[PDB]
Amino acid sequence: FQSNAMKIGVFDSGVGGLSVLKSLYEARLFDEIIYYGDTARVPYGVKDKDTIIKFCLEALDFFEQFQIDMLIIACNTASAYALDALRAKAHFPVYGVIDAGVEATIKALHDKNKEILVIATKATIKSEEYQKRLLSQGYTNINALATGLFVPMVEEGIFEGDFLQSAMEYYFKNITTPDALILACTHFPLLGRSLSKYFGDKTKLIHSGDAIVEFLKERENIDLKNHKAKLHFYASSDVESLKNTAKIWLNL
16 A cells, blocks of 8 residues: 555654644544554653663664654653754654644743743653743743653543542642643643643643644645544554553544
8 A cells, every 4th residue: 555645653652642643643634643652661751861862763763664754752851852863863854842832832822921831740841941942932930840640640540530639739739820831741631621620711731732733734744634544553562552542542
């Protein structure tokens, strides 16, 4: 089977990038998407920079046999550090989650003095990348906060209830209700309904998936497809467990 259109690949460390994969799939911008997840070596925030890079390079070598038009890095950690040596080795546009999220935040605020909150893993925060960027463009009212416990709550299917509420109430103790909240972790889009309901209408949720859909439109020549795209899933370890949560998060 060969047709004349665009085939791309999505790479996250674990299963978080499935939420990103969701938004891309609903868009119908491609005909085939290749999801790979290095689930053997999860998570990536633990390692130093050089090892993440040598790890991300091993994923590129993987994507070569498929020969894709564009590669998307769904890991905020990999996006921070590895999104460069990939380009010094790729023959095709390789993009990441951070800028799309930042740009989508700015466009949605257009107001330098508005209140921005950005939640993520401990590793995503320490890199300061989202911060280093939003400041450069003159946005002043910003705080960044590590809410790492949301990740295993997502993986155990906790999306609602007093327990999740107790978690939000815990993490968000004496916190300014922001105008826009950024989800700098790929698991977090699974808790959005609870968070907005918790934060209220004032807070505008910046979806990493939705931020990159609008992002690629700005940067690339894209056609909307009549037919829905074809999914492929690949994992370092335990592929079928990924395929499950894939069906769960999306309902194919």
